[PDB]
Amino acid sequence: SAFLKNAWAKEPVLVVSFSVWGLAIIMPMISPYTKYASMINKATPYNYPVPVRDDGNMPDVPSHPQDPLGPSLDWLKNL
Amino acid sequence: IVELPTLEELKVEEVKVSSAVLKAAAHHYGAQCDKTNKEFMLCRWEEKDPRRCLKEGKLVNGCALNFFRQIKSHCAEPFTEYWTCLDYSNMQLFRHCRQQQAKFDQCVLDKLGWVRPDLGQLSKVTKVKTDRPLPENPYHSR
Amino acid sequence: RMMRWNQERRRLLIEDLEARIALMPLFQAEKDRRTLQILRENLEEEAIIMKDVPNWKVGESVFHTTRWVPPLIGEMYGLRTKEEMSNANFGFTWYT
Amino acid sequence: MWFEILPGLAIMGVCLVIPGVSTAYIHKFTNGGKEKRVARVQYQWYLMERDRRISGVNRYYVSKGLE
Amino acid sequence: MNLYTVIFINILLSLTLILVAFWLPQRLPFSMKFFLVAITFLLFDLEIALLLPLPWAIQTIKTSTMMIMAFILVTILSLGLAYEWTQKGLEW
Amino acid sequence: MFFINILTLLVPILIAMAFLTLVERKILGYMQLRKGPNIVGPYGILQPFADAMKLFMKEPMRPLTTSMSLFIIAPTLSLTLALSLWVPLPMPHPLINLNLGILFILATSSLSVYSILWSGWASNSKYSLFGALRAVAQTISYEVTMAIILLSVLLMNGSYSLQTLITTQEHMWLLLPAWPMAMMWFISTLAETNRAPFDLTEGESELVGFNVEYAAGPFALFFMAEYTNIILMNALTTIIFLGPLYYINLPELYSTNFMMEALLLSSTFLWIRASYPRFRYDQLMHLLWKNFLPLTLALCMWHISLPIFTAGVPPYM
Numbered sequence: 001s002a003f004l005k006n007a008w009a010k011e012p013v014l015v016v017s018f019s020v021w022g023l024a025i026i027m028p029m030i031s032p033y034t035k036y037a038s039m040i041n042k043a044t045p046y047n048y049p050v051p052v053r054d055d056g057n058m059p060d061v062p063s064h065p066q067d068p069l070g071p072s073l074d075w076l077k078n079l
Numbered sequence: 080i081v082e083l084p085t086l087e088e089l090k091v092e093e094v095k096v097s098s099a100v101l102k103a104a105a106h107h108y109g110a111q112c113d114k115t116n117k118e119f120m121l122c123r124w125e126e127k128d129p130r131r132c133l134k135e136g137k138l139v140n141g142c143a144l145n146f147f148r149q150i151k152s153h154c155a156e157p158f159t160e161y162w163t164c165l166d167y168s169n170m171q172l173f174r175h176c177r178q179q180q181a182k183f184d185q186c187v188l189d190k191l192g193w194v195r196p197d198l199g200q201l202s203k204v205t206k207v208k209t210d211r212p213l214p215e216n217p218y219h220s221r
Numbered sequence: 222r223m224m225r226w227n228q229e230r231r232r233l234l235i236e237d238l239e240a241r242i243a244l245m246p247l248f249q250a251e252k253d254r255r256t257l258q259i260l261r262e263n264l265e266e267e268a269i270i271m272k273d274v275p276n277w278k279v280g281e282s283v284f285h286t287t288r289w290v291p292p293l294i295g296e297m298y299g300l301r302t303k304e305e306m307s308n309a310n311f312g313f314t315w316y317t
Numbered sequence: 318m319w320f321e322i323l324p325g326l327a328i329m330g331v332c333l334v335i336p337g338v339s340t341a342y343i344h345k346f347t348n349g350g351k352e353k354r355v356a357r358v359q360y361q362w363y364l365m366e367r368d369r370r371i372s373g374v375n376r377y378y379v380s381k382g383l384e
Numbered sequence: 385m386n387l388y389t390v391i392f393i394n395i396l397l398s399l400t401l402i403l404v405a406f407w408l409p410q411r412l413p414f415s416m417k418f419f420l421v422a423i424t425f426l427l428f429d430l431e432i433a434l435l436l437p438l439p440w441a442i443q444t445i446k447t448s449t450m451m452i453m454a455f456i457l458v459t460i461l462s463l464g465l466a467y468e469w470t471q472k473g474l475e476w
Numbered sequence: 477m478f479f480i481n482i483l484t485l486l487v488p489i490l491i492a493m494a495f496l497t498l499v500e501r502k503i504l505g506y507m508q509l510r511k512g513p514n515i516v517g518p519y520g521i522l523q524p525f526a527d528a529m530k531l532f533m534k535e536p537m538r539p540l541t542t543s544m545s546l547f548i549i550a551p552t553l554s555l556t557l558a559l560s561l562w563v564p565l566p567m568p569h570p571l572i573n574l575n576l577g578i579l580f581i582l583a584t585s586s587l588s589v590y591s592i593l594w595s596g597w598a599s600n601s602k603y604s605l606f607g608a609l610r611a612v613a614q615t616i617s618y619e620v621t622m623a624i625i626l627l628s629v630l631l632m633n634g635s636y637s638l639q640t641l642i643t644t645q646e647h648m649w650l651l652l653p654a655w656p657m658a659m660m661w662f663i664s665t666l667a668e669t670n671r672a673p674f675d676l677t678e679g680e681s682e683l684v685g686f687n688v689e690y691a692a693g694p695f696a697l698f699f700m701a702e703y704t705n706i707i708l709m710n711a712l713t714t715i716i717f718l719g720p721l722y723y724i725n726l727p728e729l730y731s732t733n734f735m736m737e738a739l740l741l742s743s744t745f746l747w748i749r750a751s752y753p754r755f756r757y758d759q760l761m762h763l764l765w766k767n768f769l770p771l772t773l774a775l776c777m778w779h780i781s782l783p784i785f786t787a788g789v790p791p792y793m
Contacts, residue, residue, distance in 0.1 A: 017770040024781035036787030038447040045202035051117045054208030070203035083261045097379035098364035109243020116246035128289035129253035136250030169352035201239040219288040224788040234791035313362040322502040324519040329495040332488040337567030337731025339484035398552040405693015
């Protein structure tokens, strides 16, 4: 601890340097948003979404984009 | 040989409007005309051969054309203002023009009833059933 | 502020990618239609020049498969306008 | 007095705004009053090219609903 | 092409100057430290490379693996530095 | 028209180069209780043109022991790269916008280290070689942190294109966030232009190395190069970290503020020079490898983490 103190006052870059190294190694682990990154980027639609044939055996897939079925990004909205 | 289709076979009307115009109305075209669009697309993907799905494609242009004719009939002025402002920007970004966008979108909800699709709800995969038999042996595998 | 601004920007990134998603089907119908035209048009000229050729069918897939094959940009424009060819090859890189 | 240093700075400044205003109006002249399209990705070059074919030879000319 | 046009004007402007400039008028310095630096420099320069794609990799769906990877790279090189400090290296 | 634009970017910049020299000789003056050059022309405005003409007229000297190409290639390369790096800069519109723009600026800067290496070998005198070796080292070292500092920026910008930052900085300068690196970008910009606090490349009291055997026209070309760079790097600070307000309707207030911020930060390295003694050769590298590189590498990781857990991954494009 004592050295820590002097280190804070002598060679006070490394201290800050390491501190950041860690804080970046922690915040991701503990945060209410970390999960969003993999989603927000997942959602971003870059490649055309090819439509599947309607065997008529699928109640999950929305038959029309504006239908009340399917995925939503309201999480992205009001984020 | 190659059995490449003939020109008369592939001579159909198209929108032929500036990219911006399509872009300005894109959100509503993705809305009013995906039933046929998708179909053409589903034809396109499962039957890798475009030549096979050409017909669906003529339907595509057509559906859109009237989509435009209806716009031409109503809220046309709005649309004209929205596209002109949208075109000026180099990447034709949507946010520079929101005041013009609100008018046309509002109007089409008064005159055409069509609705601007909320953030998303166009990216989501669609189910369209098509008579064209699920091409068996696509890739013409031996 | 950076967190909020990029989240706004990301939503915008989604709003316009979907805009093309909607516009793509039309482009696909257009591209193919035009692509075939280029192949066929080249067929006309092909026949015109390959007729005299001794026992050389006008056109034949170097590949025996009957699957539909996209043509190389080189095939589409090689015998077309050289300028057209150039535009396709290095046009986007030089942009505008 | 320090104000004498200003004449020199002014000449530098005027000569650093010219470039930014110049490049940004020789673009809006050559491209028909519309910012030069930035084609970062092919899609954009495609749309741009498509525009060329749609009218004249130049993409800046832009046909509308009346076509 | 547009770039080519600009660049050749750029060389022309410089060659013009030097030409006028020449026409108008009418053994064993070695320290491993220096070599060592150059080396370190590339080890760091290579790493810069493995770190350059990070802007595209940010958008990768994984994210967890991205950061797990990137953090490991930065940490292992920094330890390389650490040992460079600990050793006489970086002490000229 | 494109040429017109080529001329509009190069000619003005070159003229600005010239007057920076004058401005450096008056702001340093008033700080040191002296008028500076005002007697030639009105208020010294004709002073930069005057020595340019004297420099080109004086006999270019080719040392008995000197390569004749690694000698003439070196100033041509220095001016060519520096004036070239102004090609892809957002003001706000770039002459040649490149999708990987910042990598162009980093790569083009890196190439200038050779000119120093080539000139030092070409001179064939001891002062030149010793100066070049230390110089190349300084420049290269200050490239490793220089590059990492940019990579941290990019990851919060989303792309390598300098044009994107005009849209990233529409609400706040990237100084507020990332100020810790600005400082470290500013100090690195001071090293890479061999300006004062870090002018050991060519120390005068130490080795009166880069231009020892360079006089007249060759002296001028690097010379011009350095000063143009002095501006360019300051301008990159004024786009990457201090984002000038951008209004799409009127593009020149972007360039007007770009003008103001660039001049002030260009004024700052002039002010730094008069204010500080020059650092020792090892004291200079001690800073980068010990003081800055650990700060930069760690803050580099913080800039890969800030995006993810703050769900702020920047939009590509």
